Short mmCIF file of N, CA and C and ligand atoms in Angstrom, two decimals:
data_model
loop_
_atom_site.label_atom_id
_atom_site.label_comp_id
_atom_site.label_asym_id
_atom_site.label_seq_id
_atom_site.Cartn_x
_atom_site.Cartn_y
_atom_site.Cartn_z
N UNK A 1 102.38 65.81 97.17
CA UNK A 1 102.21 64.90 98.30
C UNK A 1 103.41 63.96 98.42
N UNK A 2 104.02 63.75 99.43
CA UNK A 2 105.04 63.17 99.76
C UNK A 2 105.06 62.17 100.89
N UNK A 3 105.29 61.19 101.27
CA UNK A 3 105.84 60.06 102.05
C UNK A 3 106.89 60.17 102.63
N UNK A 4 107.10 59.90 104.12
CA UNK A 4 108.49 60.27 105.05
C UNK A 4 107.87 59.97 106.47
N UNK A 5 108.88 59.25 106.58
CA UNK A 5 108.87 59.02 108.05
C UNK A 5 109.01 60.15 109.08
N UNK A 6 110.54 60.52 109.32
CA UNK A 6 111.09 61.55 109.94
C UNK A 6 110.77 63.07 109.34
N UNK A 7 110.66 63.45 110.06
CA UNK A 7 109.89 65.00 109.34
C UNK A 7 111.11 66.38 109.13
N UNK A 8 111.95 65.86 109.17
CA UNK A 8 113.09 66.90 110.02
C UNK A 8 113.47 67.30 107.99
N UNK A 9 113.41 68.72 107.92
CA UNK A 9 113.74 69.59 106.89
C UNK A 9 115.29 70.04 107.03
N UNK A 10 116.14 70.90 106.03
CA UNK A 10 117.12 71.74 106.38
C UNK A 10 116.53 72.89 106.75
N UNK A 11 117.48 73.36 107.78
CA UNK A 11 117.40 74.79 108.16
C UNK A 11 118.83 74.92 108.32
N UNK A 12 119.20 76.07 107.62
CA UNK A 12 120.49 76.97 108.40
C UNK A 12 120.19 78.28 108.82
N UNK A 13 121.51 78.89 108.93
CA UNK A 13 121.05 80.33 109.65
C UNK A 13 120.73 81.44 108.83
N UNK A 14 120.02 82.52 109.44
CA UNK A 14 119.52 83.67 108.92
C UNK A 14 120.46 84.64 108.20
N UNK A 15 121.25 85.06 108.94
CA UNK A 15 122.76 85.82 108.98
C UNK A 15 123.75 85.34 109.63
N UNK A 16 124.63 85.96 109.65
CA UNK A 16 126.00 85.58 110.50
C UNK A 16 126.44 87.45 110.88
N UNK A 17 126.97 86.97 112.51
CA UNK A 17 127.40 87.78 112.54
C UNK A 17 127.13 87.86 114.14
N UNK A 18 127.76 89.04 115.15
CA UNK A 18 127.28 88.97 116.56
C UNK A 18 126.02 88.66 117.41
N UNK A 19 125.70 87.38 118.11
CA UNK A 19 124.73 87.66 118.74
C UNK A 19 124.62 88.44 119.77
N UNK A 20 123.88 89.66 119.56
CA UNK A 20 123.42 90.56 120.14
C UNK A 20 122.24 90.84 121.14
N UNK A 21 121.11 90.03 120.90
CA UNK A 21 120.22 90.74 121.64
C UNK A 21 119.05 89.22 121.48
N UNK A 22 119.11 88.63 122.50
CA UNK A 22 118.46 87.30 122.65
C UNK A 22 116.76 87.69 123.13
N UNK A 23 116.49 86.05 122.87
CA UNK A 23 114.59 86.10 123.10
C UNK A 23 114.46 86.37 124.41
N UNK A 24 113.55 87.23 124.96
CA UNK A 24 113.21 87.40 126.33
C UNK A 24 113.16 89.21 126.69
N UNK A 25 113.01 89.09 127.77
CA UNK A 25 112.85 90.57 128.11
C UNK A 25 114.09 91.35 128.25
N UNK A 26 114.01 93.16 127.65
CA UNK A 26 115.35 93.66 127.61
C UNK A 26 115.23 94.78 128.20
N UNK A 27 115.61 95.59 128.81
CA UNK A 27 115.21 97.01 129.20
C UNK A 27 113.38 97.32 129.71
N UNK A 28 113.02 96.55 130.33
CA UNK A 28 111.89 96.34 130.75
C UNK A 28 110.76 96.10 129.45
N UNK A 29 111.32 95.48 128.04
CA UNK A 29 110.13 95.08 127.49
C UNK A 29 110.87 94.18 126.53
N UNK A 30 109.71 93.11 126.54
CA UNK A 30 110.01 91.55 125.86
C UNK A 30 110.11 91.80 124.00
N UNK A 31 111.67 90.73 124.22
CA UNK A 31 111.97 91.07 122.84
C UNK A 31 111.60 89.94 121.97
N UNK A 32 110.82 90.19 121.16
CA UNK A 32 110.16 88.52 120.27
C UNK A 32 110.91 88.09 119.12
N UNK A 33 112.42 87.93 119.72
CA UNK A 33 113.54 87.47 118.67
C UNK A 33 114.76 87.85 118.67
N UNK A 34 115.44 87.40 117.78
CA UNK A 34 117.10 87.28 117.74
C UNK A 34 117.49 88.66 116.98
N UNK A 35 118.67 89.31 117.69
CA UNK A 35 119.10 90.12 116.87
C UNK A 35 120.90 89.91 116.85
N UNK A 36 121.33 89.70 115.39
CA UNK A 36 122.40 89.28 114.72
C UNK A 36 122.88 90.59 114.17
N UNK A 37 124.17 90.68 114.74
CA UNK A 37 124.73 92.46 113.94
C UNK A 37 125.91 91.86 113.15
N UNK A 38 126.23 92.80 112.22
CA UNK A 38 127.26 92.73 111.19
C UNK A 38 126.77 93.97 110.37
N UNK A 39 127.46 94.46 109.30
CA UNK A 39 127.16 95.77 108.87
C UNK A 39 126.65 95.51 107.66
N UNK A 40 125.97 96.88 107.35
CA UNK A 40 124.97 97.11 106.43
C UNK A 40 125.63 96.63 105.18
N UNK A 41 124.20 95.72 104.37
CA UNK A 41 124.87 95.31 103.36
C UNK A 41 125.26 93.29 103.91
N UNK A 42 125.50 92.92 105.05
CA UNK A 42 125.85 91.61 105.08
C UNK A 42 124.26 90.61 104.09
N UNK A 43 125.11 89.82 103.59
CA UNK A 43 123.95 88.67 103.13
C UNK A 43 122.74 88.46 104.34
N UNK A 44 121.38 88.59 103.89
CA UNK A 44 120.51 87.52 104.82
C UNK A 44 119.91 86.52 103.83
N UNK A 45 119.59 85.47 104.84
CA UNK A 45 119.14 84.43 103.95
C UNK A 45 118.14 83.60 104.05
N UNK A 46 117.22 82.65 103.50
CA UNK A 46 115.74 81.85 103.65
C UNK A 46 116.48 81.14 104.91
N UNK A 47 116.29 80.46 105.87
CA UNK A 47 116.80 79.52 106.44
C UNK A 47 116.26 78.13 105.92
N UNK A 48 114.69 77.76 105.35
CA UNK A 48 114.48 77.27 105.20
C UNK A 48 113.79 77.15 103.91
N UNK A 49 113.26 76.19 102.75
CA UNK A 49 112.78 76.54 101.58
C UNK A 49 111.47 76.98 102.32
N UNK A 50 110.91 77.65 101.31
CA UNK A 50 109.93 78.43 101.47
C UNK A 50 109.25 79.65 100.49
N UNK A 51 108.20 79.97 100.70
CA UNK A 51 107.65 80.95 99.88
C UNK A 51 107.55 82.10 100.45
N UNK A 52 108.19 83.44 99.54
CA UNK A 52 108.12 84.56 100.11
C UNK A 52 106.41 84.96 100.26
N UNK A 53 106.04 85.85 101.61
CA UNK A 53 104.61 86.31 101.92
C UNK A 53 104.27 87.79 102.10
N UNK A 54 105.83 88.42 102.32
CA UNK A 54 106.09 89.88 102.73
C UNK A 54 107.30 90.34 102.40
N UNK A 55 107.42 91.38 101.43
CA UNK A 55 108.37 91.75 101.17
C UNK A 55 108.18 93.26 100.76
N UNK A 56 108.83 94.30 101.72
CA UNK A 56 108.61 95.61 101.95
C UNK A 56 108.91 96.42 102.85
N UNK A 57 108.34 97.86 103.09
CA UNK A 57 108.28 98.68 104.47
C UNK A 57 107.34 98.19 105.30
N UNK A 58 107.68 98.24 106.25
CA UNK A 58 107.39 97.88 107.67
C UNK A 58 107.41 98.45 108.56
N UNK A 59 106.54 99.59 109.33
CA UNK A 59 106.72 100.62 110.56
C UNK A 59 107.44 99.39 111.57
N UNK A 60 108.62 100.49 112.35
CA UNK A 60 109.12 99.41 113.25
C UNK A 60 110.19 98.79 112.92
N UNK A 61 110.44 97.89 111.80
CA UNK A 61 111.08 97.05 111.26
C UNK A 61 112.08 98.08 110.11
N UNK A 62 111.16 99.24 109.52
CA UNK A 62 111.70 99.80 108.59
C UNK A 62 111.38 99.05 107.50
N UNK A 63 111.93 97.91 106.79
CA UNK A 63 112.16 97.54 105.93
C UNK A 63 111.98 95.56 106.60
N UNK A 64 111.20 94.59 105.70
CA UNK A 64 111.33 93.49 106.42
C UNK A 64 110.67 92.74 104.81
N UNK A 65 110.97 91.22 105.44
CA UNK A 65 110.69 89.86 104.64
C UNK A 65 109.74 88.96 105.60
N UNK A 66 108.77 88.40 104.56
CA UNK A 66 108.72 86.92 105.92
C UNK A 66 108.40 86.31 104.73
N UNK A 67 109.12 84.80 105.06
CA UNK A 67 108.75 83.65 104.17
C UNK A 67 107.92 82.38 104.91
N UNK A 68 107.34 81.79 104.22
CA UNK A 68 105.93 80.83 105.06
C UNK A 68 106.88 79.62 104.38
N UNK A 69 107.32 78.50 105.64
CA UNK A 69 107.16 77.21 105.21
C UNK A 69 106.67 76.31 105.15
N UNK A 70 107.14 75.09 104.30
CA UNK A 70 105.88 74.12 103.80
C UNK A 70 105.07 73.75 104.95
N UNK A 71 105.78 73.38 106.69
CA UNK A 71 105.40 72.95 107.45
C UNK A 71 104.26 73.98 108.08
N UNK A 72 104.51 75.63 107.66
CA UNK A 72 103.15 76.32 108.14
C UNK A 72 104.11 77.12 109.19
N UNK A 73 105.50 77.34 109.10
CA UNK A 73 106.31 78.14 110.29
C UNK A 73 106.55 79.19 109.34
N UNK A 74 106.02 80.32 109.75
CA UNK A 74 106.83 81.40 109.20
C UNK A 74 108.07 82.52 110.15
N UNK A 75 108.81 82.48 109.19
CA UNK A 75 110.40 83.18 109.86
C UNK A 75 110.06 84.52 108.97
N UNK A 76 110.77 85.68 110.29
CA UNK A 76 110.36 86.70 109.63
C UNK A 76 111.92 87.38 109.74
N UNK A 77 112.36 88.36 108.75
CA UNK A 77 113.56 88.91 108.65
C UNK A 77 113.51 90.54 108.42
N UNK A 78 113.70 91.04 109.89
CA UNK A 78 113.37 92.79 109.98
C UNK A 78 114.64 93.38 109.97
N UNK A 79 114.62 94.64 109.62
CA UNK A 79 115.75 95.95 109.56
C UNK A 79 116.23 95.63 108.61
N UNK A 80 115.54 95.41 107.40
CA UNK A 80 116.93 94.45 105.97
C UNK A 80 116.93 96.12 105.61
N UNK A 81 118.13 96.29 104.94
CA UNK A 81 118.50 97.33 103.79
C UNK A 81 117.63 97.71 102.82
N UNK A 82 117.60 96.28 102.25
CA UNK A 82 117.01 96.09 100.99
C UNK A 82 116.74 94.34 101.03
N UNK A 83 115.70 94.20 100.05
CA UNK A 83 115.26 92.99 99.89
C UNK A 83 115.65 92.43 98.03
N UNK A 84 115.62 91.17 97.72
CA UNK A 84 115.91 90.63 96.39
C UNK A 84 114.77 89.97 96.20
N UNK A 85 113.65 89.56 96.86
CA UNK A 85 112.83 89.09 96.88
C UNK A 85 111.52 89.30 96.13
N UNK A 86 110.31 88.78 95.92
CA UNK A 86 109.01 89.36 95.40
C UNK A 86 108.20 88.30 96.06
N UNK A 87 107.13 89.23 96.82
CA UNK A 87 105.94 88.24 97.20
C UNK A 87 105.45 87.09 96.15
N UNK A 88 105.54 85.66 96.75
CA UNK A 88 104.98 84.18 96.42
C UNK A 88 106.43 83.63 95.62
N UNK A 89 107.46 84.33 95.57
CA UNK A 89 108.80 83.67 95.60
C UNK A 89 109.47 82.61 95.97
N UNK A 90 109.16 81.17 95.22
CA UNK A 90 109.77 80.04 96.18
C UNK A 90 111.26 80.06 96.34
N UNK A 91 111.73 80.39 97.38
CA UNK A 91 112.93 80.53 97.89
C UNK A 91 113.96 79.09 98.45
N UNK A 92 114.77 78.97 97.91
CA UNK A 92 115.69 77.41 98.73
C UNK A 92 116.41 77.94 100.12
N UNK A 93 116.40 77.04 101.09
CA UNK A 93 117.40 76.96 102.17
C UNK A 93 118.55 77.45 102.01
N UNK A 94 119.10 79.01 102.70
CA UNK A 94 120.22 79.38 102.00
C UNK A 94 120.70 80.27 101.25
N UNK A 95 119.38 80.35 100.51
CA UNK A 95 119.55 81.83 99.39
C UNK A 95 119.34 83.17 99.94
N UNK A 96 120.02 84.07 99.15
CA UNK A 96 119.90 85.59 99.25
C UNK A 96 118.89 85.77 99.53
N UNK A 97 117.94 86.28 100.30
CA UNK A 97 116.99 87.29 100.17
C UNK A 97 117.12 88.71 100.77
N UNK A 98 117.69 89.10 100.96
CA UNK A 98 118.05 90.42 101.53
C UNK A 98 119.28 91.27 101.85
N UNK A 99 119.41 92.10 102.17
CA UNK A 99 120.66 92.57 102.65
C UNK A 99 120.60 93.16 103.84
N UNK A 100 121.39 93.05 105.39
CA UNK A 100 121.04 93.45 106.58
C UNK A 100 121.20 95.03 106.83
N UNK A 101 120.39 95.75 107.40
CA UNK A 101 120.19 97.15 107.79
C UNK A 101 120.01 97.31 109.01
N UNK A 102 118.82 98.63 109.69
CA UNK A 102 119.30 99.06 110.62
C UNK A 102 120.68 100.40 110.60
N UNK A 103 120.06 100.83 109.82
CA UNK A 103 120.90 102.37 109.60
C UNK A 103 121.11 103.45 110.62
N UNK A 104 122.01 103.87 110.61
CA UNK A 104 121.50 105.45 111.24
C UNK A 104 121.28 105.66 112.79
N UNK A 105 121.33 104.44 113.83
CA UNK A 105 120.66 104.42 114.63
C UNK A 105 121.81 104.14 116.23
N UNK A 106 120.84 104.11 117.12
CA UNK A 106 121.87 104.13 118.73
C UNK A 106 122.72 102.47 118.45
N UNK A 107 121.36 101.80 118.41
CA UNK A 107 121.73 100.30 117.90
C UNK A 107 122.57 100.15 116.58
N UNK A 108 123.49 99.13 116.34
CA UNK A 108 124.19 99.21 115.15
C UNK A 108 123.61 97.66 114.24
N UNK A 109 123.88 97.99 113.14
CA UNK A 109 122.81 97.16 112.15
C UNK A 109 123.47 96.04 112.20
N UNK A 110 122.25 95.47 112.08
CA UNK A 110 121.53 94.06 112.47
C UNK A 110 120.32 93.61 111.66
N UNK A 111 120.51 92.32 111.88
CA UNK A 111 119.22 91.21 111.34
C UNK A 111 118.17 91.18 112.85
N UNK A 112 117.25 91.26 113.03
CA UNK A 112 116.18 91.26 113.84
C UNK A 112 115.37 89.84 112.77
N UNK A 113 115.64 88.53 114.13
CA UNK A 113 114.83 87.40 112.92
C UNK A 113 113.80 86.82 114.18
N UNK A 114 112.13 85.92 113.63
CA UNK A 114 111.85 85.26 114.34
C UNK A 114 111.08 84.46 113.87
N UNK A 115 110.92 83.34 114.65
CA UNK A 115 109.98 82.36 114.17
C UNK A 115 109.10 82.03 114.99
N UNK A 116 108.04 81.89 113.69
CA UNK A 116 106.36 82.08 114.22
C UNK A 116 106.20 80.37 113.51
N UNK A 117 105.71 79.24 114.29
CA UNK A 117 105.26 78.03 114.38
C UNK A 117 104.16 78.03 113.90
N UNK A 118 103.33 77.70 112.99
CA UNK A 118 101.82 78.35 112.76
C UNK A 118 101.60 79.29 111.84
N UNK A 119 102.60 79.87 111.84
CA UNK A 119 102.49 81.53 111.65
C UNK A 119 102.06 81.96 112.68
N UNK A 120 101.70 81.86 114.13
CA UNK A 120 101.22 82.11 115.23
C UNK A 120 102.12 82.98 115.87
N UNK A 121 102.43 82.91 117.14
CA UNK A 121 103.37 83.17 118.14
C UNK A 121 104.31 83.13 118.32
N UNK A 122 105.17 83.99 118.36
CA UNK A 122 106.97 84.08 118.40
C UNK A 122 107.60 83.15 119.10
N UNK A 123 108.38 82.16 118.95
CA UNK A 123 109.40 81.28 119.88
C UNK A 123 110.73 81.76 119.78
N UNK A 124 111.29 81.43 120.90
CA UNK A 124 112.68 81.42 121.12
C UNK A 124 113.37 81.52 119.65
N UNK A 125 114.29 81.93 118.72
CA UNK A 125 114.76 80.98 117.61
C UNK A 125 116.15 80.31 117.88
N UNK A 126 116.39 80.47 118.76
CA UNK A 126 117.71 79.83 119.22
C UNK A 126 117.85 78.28 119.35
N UNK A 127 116.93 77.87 119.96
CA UNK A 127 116.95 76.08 119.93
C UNK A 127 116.13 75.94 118.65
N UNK A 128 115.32 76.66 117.86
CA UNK A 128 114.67 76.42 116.65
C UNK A 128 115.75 76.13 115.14
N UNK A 129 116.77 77.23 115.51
CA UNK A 129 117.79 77.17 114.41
C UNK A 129 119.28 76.34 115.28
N UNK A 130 119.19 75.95 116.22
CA UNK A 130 120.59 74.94 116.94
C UNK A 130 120.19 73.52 117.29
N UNK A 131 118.92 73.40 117.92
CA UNK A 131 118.66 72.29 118.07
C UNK A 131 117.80 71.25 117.90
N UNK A 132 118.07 71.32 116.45
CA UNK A 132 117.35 70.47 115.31
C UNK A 132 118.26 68.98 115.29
N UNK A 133 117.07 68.30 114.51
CA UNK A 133 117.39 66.74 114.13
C UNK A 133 117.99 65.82 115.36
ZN1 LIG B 1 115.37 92.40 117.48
#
């Protein structure tokens, strides 16, 4: 239990690398998140501390992470390569958890990231991870 006025946590970014493919609708169907390319193998990372909740195969995703933060937002991190992670993993702002994938495919590999407020419903992550504090 903790005391604080201002509620504002660190967050940095997921990956680095081209933004590619923004929140909203794409080819006639809505995309529920950010997709960041750079090649297989780039670092992904917690954005925020947090506890790993999913770490595995994923139809769709192929391969994915999601970590739950303290505030109850979970960020989820799809198409990874590979993961470093283990479910209930407290993770810091920043750290390794994955490596970006998306193999093999028309699309070229990428981080597919989003954040769920609640754990609920997908938002934008673009003003979630830029326009903080
Ligand atoms: Zn995507």
């Amino acid at each position: 239990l903790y005391f604080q006025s201002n509620a504002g946590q660190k967050v940095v970014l997921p990956a680095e690398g081209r933004f590619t493919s923004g929140y909203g609708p794409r080819w006639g169907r809505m995309h529920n998140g950010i997709d960041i390319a750079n090649g297989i193998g780039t670092p992904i990372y917690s954005v925020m501390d947090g506890t790993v909740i999913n770490a595995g195969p994923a139809q769709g995703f192929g391969k994915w992470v999601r970590v739950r933060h303290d505030d109850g937002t979970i960020t989820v991190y799809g198409h990874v390569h590979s993961f470093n992670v283990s479910v209930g993993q407290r993770v810091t702002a920043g750290e390794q958890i994955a490596e970006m994938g998306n193999e093999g495919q028309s699309t070229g590999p990428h981080l597919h990231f989003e954040v769920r407020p609640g754990g609920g419903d997908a938002i934008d992550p673009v003003p979630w991870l830029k326009e903080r504090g």
